[PDB]
Design a protein around this ligand. Sequence first.
Ligand code: K
Ligand code: K
Ligand code: K
Length: 179
Amino acid sequence: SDPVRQYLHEIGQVPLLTLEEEIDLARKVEEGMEAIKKLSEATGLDQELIREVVRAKILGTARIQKIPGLKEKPDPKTVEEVDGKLKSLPKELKRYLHIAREGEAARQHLIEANLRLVVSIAKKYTGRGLSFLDLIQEGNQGLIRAVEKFEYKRRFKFSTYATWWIRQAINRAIADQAR
DNA sequence: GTATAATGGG
Ligand SMILES: [K+]
Ligand SMILES: [K+]
Ligand SMILES: [K+]
């Protein structure tokens, strides 16, 4: 497939993370999630809503843009409104917004650096009801779930935890396609 | 709650 070949081409340019970059990114993601909790408490808005909007603002400096199976940006009207409430917060709370920005910049980076992993697991599940693209989308959503639950303090490699999640996602999608 | 590492494959 032409869009697929192009996708594989694009993700292949993304270098693998060292262990040290991995921990740094994972740390920034934790920190970003605690910051967004503080912003939620202070504004009364949904944590995931804040996260999505902050994320929408960091995608400008992203390397891979249309990632298959990833949730789409909210509608710009909601971005503008929520972004407005955040920018307008008090001095003390604007450092939390900075931390949340790096957290979401780091999430995106960490995700891009492991798209190659999903593809390789995907390859083991072809001919089972779902196209390759479909496998990648289901795999990608496992990846995202892994970034959310990964605990770097455990000292296990990200690929270890990510792989578990990616298989779960792919195994569930096959069993649902099959009634 | 799900955790060896795994990102061409074995
Ligand atoms: K070789
Ligand atoms: K070779
Ligand atoms: K070899």
